[PDB]
Amino acid sequence: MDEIRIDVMRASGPGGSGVNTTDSAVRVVHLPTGIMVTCQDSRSQIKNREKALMILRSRLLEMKRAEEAER
Amino acid sequence: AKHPVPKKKTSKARRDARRSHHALTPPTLVPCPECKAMKPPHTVCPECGYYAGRKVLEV
Amino acid sequence: MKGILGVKVGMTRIFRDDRAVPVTVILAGPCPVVQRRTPEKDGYTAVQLGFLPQNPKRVNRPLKGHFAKAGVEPVRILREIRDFNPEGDTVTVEIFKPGERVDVTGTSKGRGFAGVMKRWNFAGGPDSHGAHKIHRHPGSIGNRKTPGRVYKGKKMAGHYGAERVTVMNLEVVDVIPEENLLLVKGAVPGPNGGLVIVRETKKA
Amino acid sequence: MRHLKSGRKLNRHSSHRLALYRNQAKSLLTHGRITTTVPKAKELRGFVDHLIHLAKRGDLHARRLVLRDLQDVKLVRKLFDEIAPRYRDRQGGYTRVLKLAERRRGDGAPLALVELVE
Amino acid sequence: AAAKC
Amino acid sequence: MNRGALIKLVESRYVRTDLPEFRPGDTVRVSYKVKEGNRTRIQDFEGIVIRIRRNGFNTTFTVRKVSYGVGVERIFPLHSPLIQKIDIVQRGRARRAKLYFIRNLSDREIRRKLRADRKRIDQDRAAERAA
Amino acid sequence: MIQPQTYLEVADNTGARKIMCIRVLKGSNAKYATVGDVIVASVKEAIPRGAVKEGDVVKAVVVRTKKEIKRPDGSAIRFDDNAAVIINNQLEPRGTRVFGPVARELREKGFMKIVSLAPEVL
RNA sequence: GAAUGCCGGCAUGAGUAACGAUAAAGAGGGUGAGAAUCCCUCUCGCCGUAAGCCCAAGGGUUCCUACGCAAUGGUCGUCAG
RNA sequence: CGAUGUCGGCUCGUCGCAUCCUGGGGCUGAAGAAGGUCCCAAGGGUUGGGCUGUUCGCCCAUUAAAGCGGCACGCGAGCUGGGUUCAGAACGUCGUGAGACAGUUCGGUCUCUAUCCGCCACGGGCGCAGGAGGCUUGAGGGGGGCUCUUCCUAGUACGAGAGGACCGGAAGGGACGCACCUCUGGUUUCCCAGCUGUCCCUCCAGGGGCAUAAGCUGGGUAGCCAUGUGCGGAAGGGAUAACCGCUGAAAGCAUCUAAGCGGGAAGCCCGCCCCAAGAUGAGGCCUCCCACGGCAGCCGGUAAGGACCCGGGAAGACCACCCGGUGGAUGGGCCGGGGGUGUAAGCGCCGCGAGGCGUUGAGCCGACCGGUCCCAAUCGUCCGAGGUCU
Ligand SMILES: [Mg+2]
Ligand SMILES: [Mg+2]
Ligand SMILES: [Mg+2]
Ligand SMILES: [Mg+2]
Ligand SMILES: [Mg+2]
Ligand SMILES: [Mg+2]
Ligand SMILES: [Mg+2]
Ligand SMILES: [Mg+2]
Ligand SMILES: [Mg+2]
Ligand SMILES: [Mg+2]
Ligand SMILES: [Mg+2]
Ligand SMILES: [Mg+2]
Ligand SMILES: [Mg+2]
Ligand SMILES: [Mg+2]
Ligand SMILES: [Mg+2]
Ligand SMILES: [Mg+2]
Ligand SMILES: [Mg+2]
Ligand SMILES: [Mg+2]
Ligand SMILES: [Mg+2]
Ligand SMILES: [Mg+2]
Ligand SMILES: [Mg+2]
Ligand SMILES: [Mg+2]
Ligand SMILES: [Mg+2]
Ligand SMILES: [Mg+2]
Ligand SMILES: [Mg+2]
Ligand SMILES: [Mg+2]
Ligand SMILES: [Mg+2]
Ligand SMILES: [Mg+2]
Ligand SMILES: [Mg+2]
Ligand SMILES: [Mg+2]
Ligand SMILES: [Mg+2]
Ligand SMILES: [Mg+2]
Ligand SMILES: [Mg+2]
Ligand SMILES: [Mg+2]
Ligand SMILES: [Mg+2]
Ligand SMILES: [Mg+2]
Ligand SMILES: [Mg+2]
Ligand SMILES: [Mg+2]
Ligand SMILES: [Mg+2]
Ligand SMILES: [Mg+2]
Ligand SMILES: [Mg+2]
Ligand SMILES: [Mg+2]
Ligand SMILES: [Mg+2]
Ligand SMILES: [Mg+2]
Ligand SMILES: [Mg+2]
Ligand SMILES: [Mg+2]
Ligand SMILES: [Mg+2]
Ligand SMILES: [Mg+2]
Ligand SMILES: [Mg+2]
Ligand SMILES: [Mg+2]
Ligand SMILES: [Mg+2]
Ligand SMILES: [Mg+2]
Ligand SMILES: [Mg+2]
Ligand SMILES: [Mg+2]
Ligand SMILES: [Mg+2]
Ligand SMILES: [Mg+2]
Ligand SMILES: [Mg+2]
Ligand SMILES: [Mg+2]
Ligand SMILES: [Mg+2]
Ligand SMILES: [Mg+2]
Ligand SMILES: [Mg+2]
Ligand SMILES: [Mg+2]
Ligand SMILES: [Mg+2]
Ligand SMILES: [Mg+2]
Ligand SMILES: [Mg+2]
Ligand SMILES: [Mg+2]
Ligand SMILES: [Mg+2]
Ligand SMILES: [Mg+2]
Ligand SMILES: [Mg+2]
Ligand SMILES: [Mg+2]
Ligand SMILES: [Mg+2]
Ligand SMILES: [Mg+2]
Ligand SMILES: [Mg+2]
Ligand SMILES: [Mg+2]
Ligand SMILES: [Mg+2]
Ligand SMILES: [Mg+2]
Ligand SMILES: [Mg+2]
Ligand SMILES: [Mg+2]
Ligand SMILES: [Mg+2]
Ligand SMILES: [Mg+2]
Ligand SMILES: [Mg+2]
Ligand SMILES: [Mg+2]
Ligand SMILES: [Mg+2]
Ligand SMILES: [Mg+2]
Ligand SMILES: [Mg+2]
Ligand SMILES: [Mg+2]
Ligand SMILES: [Mg+2]
Ligand SMILES: [Mg+2]
Ligand SMILES: [Mg+2]
Ligand SMILES: [Mg+2]
Ligand SMILES: [Mg+2]
Ligand SMILES: [Mg+2]
Ligand SMILES: [Mg+2]
Ligand SMILES: [Mg+2]
Ligand SMILES: [Mg+2]
Ligand SMILES: [Mg+2]
Ligand SMILES: [Mg+2]
Ligand SMILES: [Mg+2]
Ligand SMILES: [Mg+2]
Ligand SMILES: [Mg+2]
Ligand SMILES: [Mg+2]
Ligand SMILES: [Mg+2]
Ligand SMILES: [Mg+2]
Ligand SMILES: [Mg+2]
Ligand SMILES: [Mg+2]
Ligand SMILES: [Mg+2]
Ligand SMILES: [Mg+2]
Ligand SMILES: [Mg+2]
Ligand SMILES: [Mg+2]
Ligand SMILES: [Mg+2]
Ligand SMILES: [Mg+2]
Ligand SMILES: [Mg+2]
Ligand SMILES: [Mg+2]
Ligand SMILES: [Mg+2]
Ligand SMILES: [Mg+2]
Ligand SMILES: [Mg+2]
Ligand SMILES: [Mg+2]
Ligand SMILES: [Mg+2]
Ligand SMILES: [Mg+2]
Ligand SMILES: [Mg+2]
Ligand SMILES: [Mg+2]
Ligand SMILES: [Mg+2]
Ligand SMILES: [Mg+2]
Ligand SMILES: [Mg+2]
Ligand SMILES: [Mg+2]
Ligand SMILES: [Mg+2]
Ligand SMILES: [Mg+2]
Ligand SMILES: [Mg+2]
Ligand SMILES: [Mg+2]
Ligand SMILES: [Mg+2]
Ligand SMILES: [Mg+2]
Ligand SMILES: [Mg+2]
Ligand SMILES: [Mg+2]
Ligand SMILES: [Mg+2]
Ligand SMILES: [Mg+2]
Ligand SMILES: [Mg+2]
Ligand SMILES: [Mg+2]
Ligand SMILES: [Mg+2]
Ligand SMILES: [Mg+2]
Ligand SMILES: [Mg+2]
Ligand SMILES: [Mg+2]
Ligand SMILES: [Mg+2]
Ligand SMILES: [Mg+2]
Ligand SMILES: [Mg+2]
Ligand SMILES: [Mg+2]
Ligand SMILES: [Mg+2]
Ligand SMILES: [Mg+2]
Ligand SMILES: [Mg+2]
Ligand SMILES: [Mg+2]
Ligand SMILES: [Mg+2]
Ligand SMILES: [Mg+2]
Ligand SMILES: [Mg+2]
Ligand SMILES: [Mg+2]
Ligand SMILES: [Mg+2]
Ligand SMILES: [Mg+2]
Ligand SMILES: [Mg+2]
Ligand SMILES: [Mg+2]
Ligand SMILES: [Mg+2]
Ligand SMILES: [Mg+2]
Ligand SMILES: [Mg+2]
Ligand SMILES: [Mg+2]
Ligand SMILES: [Mg+2]
Ligand SMILES: [Mg+2]
Ligand SMILES: [Mg+2]
Ligand SMILES: [Mg+2]
Ligand SMILES: [Mg+2]
Ligand SMILES: [Mg+2]
Ligand SMILES: [Mg+2]
Ligand SMILES: [Mg+2]
Ligand SMILES: [Mg+2]
Ligand SMILES: [Mg+2]
Ligand SMILES: [Mg+2]
Ligand SMILES: [Mg+2]
Ligand SMILES: [Mg+2]
Ligand SMILES: [Mg+2]
Ligand SMILES: [Mg+2]
Ligand SMILES: [Mg+2]
Ligand SMILES: [Mg+2]
Ligand SMILES: [Mg+2]
Ligand SMILES: [Mg+2]
Ligand SMILES: [Mg+2]
Ligand SMILES: [Mg+2]
Ligand SMILES: [Mg+2]
Ligand SMILES: [Mg+2]
Ligand SMILES: [Mg+2]
Ligand SMILES: [Mg+2]
Ligand SMILES: [Mg+2]
Ligand SMILES: [Mg+2]
Ligand SMILES: [Mg+2]
Ligand SMILES: [Mg+2]
Ligand SMILES: [Mg+2]
Ligand SMILES: [Mg+2]
Ligand SMILES: [Mg+2]
Ligand SMILES: [Mg+2]
Ligand SMILES: [Mg+2]
Ligand SMILES: [Mg+2]
Ligand SMILES: [Mg+2]
Ligand SMILES: [Mg+2]
Ligand SMILES: [Mg+2]
Ligand SMILES: [Mg+2]
Ligand SMILES: [Mg+2]
Ligand SMILES: [Mg+2]
Ligand SMILES: [Mg+2]
Ligand SMILES: [Mg+2]
Ligand SMILES: [Mg+2]
Ligand SMILES: [Mg+2]
Ligand SMILES: [Mg+2]
Ligand SMILES: [Mg+2]
Ligand SMILES: [Mg+2]
Ligand SMILES: [Mg+2]
Ligand SMILES: [Mg+2]
Ligand SMILES: [Mg+2]
Ligand SMILES: [Mg+2]
Ligand SMILES: [Mg+2]
Ligand SMILES: [Mg+2]
Ligand SMILES: [Mg+2]
Ligand SMILES: [Mg+2]
Ligand SMILES: [Mg+2]
Ligand SMILES: [Mg+2]
Ligand SMILES: [Mg+2]
Ligand SMILES: [Mg+2]
Ligand SMILES: [Mg+2]
Ligand SMILES: [Mg+2]
Ligand SMILES: [Mg+2]
Ligand SMILES: [Mg+2]
Ligand SMILES: [Mg+2]
Ligand SMILES: [Mg+2]
Ligand SMILES: [Mg+2]
Ligand SMILES: [Mg+2]
Ligand SMILES: [Mg+2]
Ligand SMILES: [Mg+2]
Ligand SMILES: [Mg+2]
Ligand SMILES: [Mg+2]
Ligand SMILES: [Zn+2]
């Protein structure tokens, strides 16, 4: 988590007064590689931060499992 | 706009404080040297018709 | 801290060393010393200068006495030059040699009621894209409930110009003592025919 | 701002204001004296003075110049043969404006008369 | 008019 | 005071009277003192006078020319001391005082528009016939 | 007076025809470029097999402007177009020829090789 | 004494916004207690596939003349549907 | 919940400092140059673009830097309305269906008049123990406060080399500000010319109306202006922050400290520019008038003065301010110059003619610099002290 930055921000699309004022959207950046994941699937910044980190790892894992395959 | 409106009725004291600047000033009037009638300065006298010592128009 | 009273003649340019020099011309002298402020008497030092001769039929009795107590023929303009005690009792353009730097004070041109764009260089409004009757308007003038007021000194429309303005560190391009003319490089506040003050510069 | 601008506007556009000066020139040269508002009077002075001066010149060009504004050869003939002779030795200022004392009832307009000089 | 929904 | 006469007085120590009169449409060659890094040479600039804006001593005239493919206009203060001399190369006859319209014309069309001012050419030839 | 979006002719034989200004290389936020100022530009139009090609991000010094340049002797000069010579980071021209006149200002600003190669300096 | 109560009267905003197409006015003469505003004359401007002329609907004396100006006329009024 | 309008943008700022830059520092695994890290510091500054409704983020090109936050996630009786957030329509999906969706897609009415506080400007009143005309002191406010590049020192110190200073001294910029209009560049509603159609005067010639609230076109003075010109940021004095000391105990040594003294920042106080005595603490100076008549009061008539009225004004919404009022150059005219336009009409000549040439830089000609009493500022009216007490 020290080479990972987490951005929060307003989401997109529907939600009335809620979507207008809520920092529910999450970005997660793996700072060395630069690969990111965004998520606004739910209205919760927490559930979205969790689903984004999970995907960032799963993606980084595949990149790591793939450079090994090449080797 | 959103239609500004008076928030409170203006008081008798305060509406009249506003009109404290409304009095008329009486009209500046000088005597006509010819016929001694009162008239505004710098105009032909509407009574005898004189200005600058001579007659200028029929009254 | 020499100074003199003067009238703005107009602008032109001269060529000095193969260069155009934008100059304002000032008719400065001659300025009869009318009263000297002393510390023993007034608490500070300054010289009250006179400028432009006046038709004595126009100078009322309190002023005629003032002029008389000095030996001066009635002058139109009385103005002081702070911290200046000339030796003689007449101040002329010769207190300035070409190459000195001066500060010049004048009454700027009056814009009257001036909009927020002309007065404060505000960006104004858009002119298309739906802008609604706000093309030269100031926009927000505040916040909301905190502080719930508008700051003192907030830039708004209102009168602009016709105020004291000193332009500083102007060059003295030439001095024509024959005609009490002063050439100065640059721009000087106010209109042609306006009354100005030319002091020694305060820059170093 | 209005710095050093000559010319009233009298709340008219360019062609109406010109026509106003022309129709007042016609009335004035016609009757010798007209009553109008004070501002209009003050502006008619120079507009008419100039026309009289061209009449004092008498040449055909001058007449053709005057007719651009006055358009009435009879009236222009009156100007060239009766009015203009009276001013041969007067050096401008063929017109005068004297303010009246009473105002129009319906709008309060200060009035004045404009007339040709002796 | 615009709405608080 | 006479403020205009004071200005005229100030300006009068700089006024030239050695330059020939010329009109818009005349072709003219200005010999202009130009500093080049170090020294001062006289670089000529010849072209049609497309404009003369008059303000007494503050009069400037604008000279147009095409130079190696590109049009060049050069503005000169008429009383500048940087001007060595002006030579009248041709007298052209215009019908207006500002010839900006020749920026959009061909060479052929300009020749059609500013024909030789025969009258002022005979004036220029009847002069110098003073020996 | 050249700013971003401004199109300039190319007065050299690099193969560039038209560059479009995208930056005035004059301090933090200069609004305009005049004669002698370096700009950055993208090459919008070029000719085949030239050094530069359509799309490069090059530098260039303005040599001719349509807004008149003013001068201390009280004169002014005006050109019919906006022109620039494409240069390298050491400020030297990259072509081998300069087409058309150039402003004498370029001399007093370090562009002698450009002033040298130009057919006329005004 | 309160019901965004009911009826009426009178205030505040205020001498404020406005006085209904930016086709446009000016003078002279007349009338009258009173005239920017009514009548007459000359000048100017506007419409002219109309902002002119004639029908049909609808309206219902608004038509013409004399006498009038409290109210109606967004001002005035001697004028007027 | 008998309504506290909700994203983003625009505009306008203001504050915080956990400081992005610039200033001052200590430590460095600081040779130099360049960094790292922390401390002091909020004065000023903190760019333009591509994508997206975006906030956010990525990217391009720069930069000294491209700071993070608060102010109802500042600011819709300031604007916007792309998104959100009605009714229409469609897709995917769910539902037998009517319909549904922090799913998508195209569309979809944002209210002329400010009463009070506040703010920006401008007056009226009264006060400032006599009444007046001038000139001023500056308590206290406000404005401003940025920075880079190159060159010299010096290719020196340092460094194997590459690279490359401190200190000090020049010059040139960017942005911002105030003023100005000589130049550059605008505008310039009638200042000049040209042109069409039509109607008209008067047939030709010459003109006038209308084609916009200039018919169109080419130009264009003053003025107002920036893209144009001048000038500003300081210098300098003083007190400080972190930090570094001198002398020096307690505590025989040591210690910047306990006694005392010094150095030290773009910051702080002063300095600069502007406002300012309603500064009711109502200041100072110079000059003027002056103990008038009638029972700290009232009433009269005057004083020095002032106002009214008028001609005006790069002053101005009204007001105010400034100038002038026949003892006068204030506005209008007239004259001379400037300036614009660019060779009027009429005539003569050449051409069958459209036209051309000459008379001619002619004629016309706002505002600019001036002169000139030709025209108008006639003639006047009113207000205005006699000074309380200790
Ligand atoms: Mg963190
Ligand atoms: Mg959201
Ligand atoms: Mg979207
Ligand atoms: Mg929904
Ligand atoms: Mg929330
Ligand atoms: Mg609104
Ligand atoms: Mg609105
Ligand atoms: Mg609206
Ligand atoms: Mg309303
Ligand atoms: Mg209430
Ligand atoms: Mg009220
Ligand atoms: Mg009440
Ligand atoms: Mg009441
Ligand atoms: Mg009130
Ligand atoms: Mg009462
Ligand atoms: Mg009122
Ligand atoms: Mg009264
Ligand atoms: Mg000299
Ligand atoms: Mg002045
Ligand atoms: Mg002024
Ligand atoms: Mg003004
Ligand atoms: Mg301003
Ligand atoms: Mg501006
Ligand atoms: Mg803007
Ligand atoms: Mg903008
Ligand atoms: Mg704008
Ligand atoms: Mg608009
Ligand atoms: Mg709208
Ligand atoms: Mg609005
Ligand atoms: Mg609009
Ligand atoms: Mg504005
Ligand atoms: Mg606004
Ligand atoms: Mg609120
Ligand atoms: Mg709000
Ligand atoms: Mg509060
Ligand atoms: Mg003022
Ligand atoms: Mg300097
Ligand atoms: Mg003199
Ligand atoms: Mg002054
Ligand atoms: Mg004066
Ligand atoms: Mg204005
Ligand atoms: Mg205006
Ligand atoms: Mg004037
Ligand atoms: Mg006019
Ligand atoms: Mg009007
Ligand atoms: Mg009107
Ligand atoms: Mg009106
Ligand atoms: Mg018209
Ligand atoms: Mg008539
Ligand atoms: Mg009669
Ligand atoms: Mg009448
Ligand atoms: Mg009238
Ligand atoms: Mg004849
Ligand atoms: Mg009168
Ligand atoms: Mg009157
Ligand atoms: Mg009425
Ligand atoms: Mg009436
Ligand atoms: Mg002058
Ligand atoms: Mg040619
Ligand atoms: Mg031709
Ligand atoms: Mg021809
Ligand atoms: Mg000829
Ligand atoms: Mg090319
Ligand atoms: Mg190629
Ligand atoms: Mg391509
Ligand atoms: Mg391509
Ligand atoms: Mg090249
Ligand atoms: Mg070329
Ligand atoms: Mg009860
Ligand atoms: Mg009820
Ligand atoms: Mg009820
Ligand atoms: Mg009843
Ligand atoms: Mg009722
Ligand atoms: Mg009721
Ligand atoms: Mg009632
Ligand atoms: Mg009422
Ligand atoms: Mg009511
Ligand atoms: Mg009321
Ligand atoms: Mg009122
Ligand atoms: Mg109101
Ligand atoms: Mg109002
Ligand atoms: Mg209303
Ligand atoms: Mg109204
Ligand atoms: Mg209406
Ligand atoms: Mg109407
Ligand atoms: Mg209409
Ligand atoms: Mg309209
Ligand atoms: Mg119409
Ligand atoms: Mg009207
Ligand atoms: Mg008439
Ligand atoms: Mg009438
Ligand atoms: Mg009538
Ligand atoms: Mg009548
Ligand atoms: Mg009437
Ligand atoms: Mg009546
Ligand atoms: Mg009638
Ligand atoms: Mg027809
Ligand atoms: Mg019927
Ligand atoms: Mg009916
Ligand atoms: Mg009936
Ligand atoms: Mg009635
Ligand atoms: Mg009646
Ligand atoms: Mg009635
Ligand atoms: Mg009756
Ligand atoms: Mg009625
Ligand atoms: Mg009525
Ligand atoms: Mg009505
Ligand atoms: Mg009657
Ligand atoms: Mg009838
Ligand atoms: Mg609620
Ligand atoms: Mg309610
Ligand atoms: Mg409520
Ligand atoms: Mg409500
Ligand atoms: Mg409410
Ligand atoms: Mg700190
Ligand atoms: Mg720092
Ligand atoms: Mg540092
Ligand atoms: Mg450090
Ligand atoms: Mg180092
Ligand atoms: Mg530290
Ligand atoms: Mg700061
Ligand atoms: Mg964008
Ligand atoms: Mg694009
Ligand atoms: Mg974006
Ligand atoms: Mg995003
Ligand atoms: Mg740096
Ligand atoms: Mg960086
Ligand atoms: Mg950016
Ligand atoms: Mg902020
Ligand atoms: Mg908010
Ligand atoms: Mg925000
Ligand atoms: Mg908001
Ligand atoms: Mg609000
Ligand atoms: Mg709104
Ligand atoms: Mg909003
Ligand atoms: Mg509201
Ligand atoms: Mg609001
Ligand atoms: Mg509100
Ligand atoms: Mg929408
Ligand atoms: Mg929309
Ligand atoms: Mg509904
Ligand atoms: Mg389906
Ligand atoms: Mg089911
Ligand atoms: Mg199904
Ligand atoms: Mg199922
Ligand atoms: Mg669903
Ligand atoms: Mg949906
Ligand atoms: Mg969602
Ligand atoms: Mg959607
Ligand atoms: Mg779709
Ligand atoms: Mg649509
Ligand atoms: Mg939608
Ligand atoms: Mg509305
Ligand atoms: Mg109010
Ligand atoms: Mg309140
Ligand atoms: Mg208030
Ligand atoms: Mg007061
Ligand atoms: Mg006293
Ligand atoms: Mg006084
Ligand atoms: Mg003072
Ligand atoms: Mg102070
Ligand atoms: Mg205070
Ligand atoms: Mg201060
Ligand atoms: Mg500073
Ligand atoms: Mg070296
Ligand atoms: Mg050394
Ligand atoms: Mg080296
Ligand atoms: Mg240095
Ligand atoms: Mg600032
Ligand atoms: Mg200022
Ligand atoms: Mg400014
Ligand atoms: Mg100015
Ligand atoms: Mg200005
Ligand atoms: Mg100019
Ligand atoms: Mg000028
Ligand atoms: Mg100008
Ligand atoms: Mg110009
Ligand atoms: Mg005309
Ligand atoms: Mg004909
Ligand atoms: Mg015609
Ligand atoms: Mg007609
Ligand atoms: Mg018509
Ligand atoms: Mg029309
Ligand atoms: Mg049109
Ligand atoms: Mg016309
Ligand atoms: Mg034009
Ligand atoms: Mg122009
Ligand atoms: Mg102009
Ligand atoms: Mg101009
Ligand atoms: Mg200006
Ligand atoms: Mg500029
Ligand atoms: Mg010891
Ligand atoms: Mg020791
Ligand atoms: Mg101590
Ligand atoms: Mg110390
Ligand atoms: Mg030391
Ligand atoms: Mg110190
Ligand atoms: Mg500094
Ligand atoms: Mg002061
Ligand atoms: Mg006082
Ligand atoms: Mg004072
Ligand atoms: Mg008290
Ligand atoms: Mg006291
Ligand atoms: Mg106090
Ligand atoms: Mg006291
Ligand atoms: Mg005092
Ligand atoms: Mg004192
Ligand atoms: Mg006064
Ligand atoms: Mg006035
Ligand atoms: Mg006033
Ligand atoms: Mg006024
Ligand atoms: Mg006076
Ligand atoms: Mg008098
Ligand atoms: Mg008097
Ligand atoms: Mg005069
Ligand atoms: Mg005069
Ligand atoms: Mg005088
Ligand atoms: Mg006048
Ligand atoms: Mg001329
Ligand atoms: Mg000819
Ligand atoms: Mg002719
Ligand atoms: Mg002819
Ligand atoms: Mg002819
Ligand atoms: Mg023949
Ligand atoms: Mg011809
Ligand atoms: Mg001329
Ligand atoms: Mg004419
Ligand atoms: Mg003349
Ligand atoms: Mg003349
Ligand atoms: Mg004239
Ligand atoms: Mg001038
Ligand atoms: Mg005289
Ligand atoms: Mg009298
Ligand atoms: Zn009388």
From Swiss-Prot, chain A:
Give its localization. Cytoplasm
Classify the main location.
Answer: cytoplasm
Q: What does this protein do?
A: Peptide chain release factor 1 directs the termination of translation in response to the peptide chain termination codons UAG and UAA.
| Keyword Protein biosynthesis (UniProt) | yes
For this UniProt record, give its keywords in alphabetical order, as a comma-separated list. Cytoplasm, Methylation, Protein biosynthesis
Official protein name in the record = Peptide chain release factor 1
Please list the coiled coil stretches: none
Q: Which family does it belong to?
A: Belongs to the prokaryotic/mitochondrial release factor family.
GO cellular component annotations of the record? cytoplasm
The Swiss-Prot or TrEMBL record annotates one GO molecular function as: translation release factor activity, codon specific
Could you say which residues of the full protein are shown?
A: 214 to 284 of 354
User: Is-annotated flag, keyword Ribosomal protein?
Assistant: no
PTM annotation, UniProt: Methylated by PrmC. Methylation increases the termination efficiency of RF1.
Summarize subunit and interaction data from the UniProt record for this chain: Interacts with the ribosome.
In the record, N5-methylglutamine modifications are located at 17
Curated annotation (Swiss-Prot), chain B:
Q: Which GO terms describe its molecular function?
A: structural constituent of ribosome
Q: Where is this region: Disordered?
A: 1-29
| PANTHER family linked | 50S RIBOSOMAL PROTEIN L32, LARGE RIBOSOMAL SUBUNIT PROTEIN BL32
Q: Which InterPro entries match?
A: Ribosomal_bL32, Ribosomal_bL32_bact, Ribosomal_zn-bd
What is the role of the protein in this entry? Found on the solvent side of the large subunit.
Subunit structure comment from the entry: Part of the 50S ribosomal subunit.
Query: NCBIfam families under this entry?
Result: rpmF_bact
- Give GO BP annotations, semicolon-separated: translation
Keyword annotations: Ribonucleoprotein, Ribosomal protein
Can you supply one Gene Ontology CC term for this chain's record?
large ribosomal subunit
Which Pfam families does this UniProt record tie to the protein?
Ribosomal_L32p
Q: What is this protein called?
A: Large ribosomal subunit protein bL32
Q: Which family does it belong to?
A: Belongs to the bacterial ribosomal protein bL32 family.
Name the domain of life this protein comes from.
Bacteria
Q: What are the Basic residues biased-composition ranges?
A: 1-22
Swiss-Prot record, chain C:
- Family that this chain belongs to: Belongs to the universal ribosomal protein uL3 family.
The record's section on InterPro entries has:
Ribosomal_uL3, Ribosomal_uL3_bac/org-type, Ribosomal_uL3_CS, Transl_B-barrel_sf
The domain of life is Bacteria
Per the record, its GO cellular-component terms are: cytosolic large ribosomal subunit
Q: What is the protein's species of origin?
A: Thermus thermophilus (strain ATCC 27634 / DSM 579 / HB8)
UniProt-listed PROSITE patterns:
RIBOSOMAL_L3
Q: Please name the NCBIfam families in this protein's record.
A: L3_bact
The coding gene here is rplC
Entry PTM: The mass differences between the observed and calculated masses are suggested to be due to methylation, which is known to occur in the E.coli and R.palustris orthologs.
Q: Which HAMAP family match?
A: Ribosomal_uL3_B (MF_01325_B)
What's the name of the protein? Large ribosomal subunit protein uL3
The alphabetized list of GO BP terms reads: translation
Alphabetically sorted, this entry's keywords are: Methylation, Ribonucleoprotein, Ribosomal protein, RNA-binding, rRNA-binding
Q: Which Pfam families match?
A: Ribosomal_L3 (PF00297)
Q: In the record, what terms sit under GO molecular function?
A: rRNA binding; structural constituent of ribosome
Cleaved signal peptide residues: none
How does the annotation summarize its subunit structure? Part of the 50S ribosomal subunit. Forms a cluster with proteins L14 and L19.
Task of the protein: One of the primary rRNA binding proteins, it binds directly near the 3'-end of the 23S rRNA, where it nucleates assembly of the 50S subunit.
From Swiss-Prot, chain F:
Q: What is this protein called?
A: Large ribosomal subunit protein bL19
What family is reported?
Belongs to the bacterial ribosomal protein bL19 family.
Domain of life here?
Answer: Bacteria
Function description: Contacts the 16S rRNA of the 30S subunit (part of bridge B6), connecting the 2 subunits.
Which InterPro entries does the protein's record reference?
Answer: Ribosomal_bL19, Ribosomal_bL19_CS, Ribosomal_bL19_sf, Translation_prot_SH3-like_sf
State the species of origin.
Answer: Thermus thermophilus (strain ATCC 27634 / DSM 579 / HB8)
Q: Which GO terms describe its cellular component?
A: cytosolic large ribosomal subunit
What keywords is this UniProt entry annotated with?
Answer: Ribonucleoprotein, Ribosomal protein, RNA-binding, rRNA-binding
Q: Which HAMAP family match?
A: Ribosomal_bL19
Whom does it interact with, and what assembly results?
Part of the 50S risobomal subunit. Contacts protein L14. Forms a bridge to the 30S subunit in the 70S ribosome, contacting the 16S rRNA.
Name the encoding gene, please.
rplS
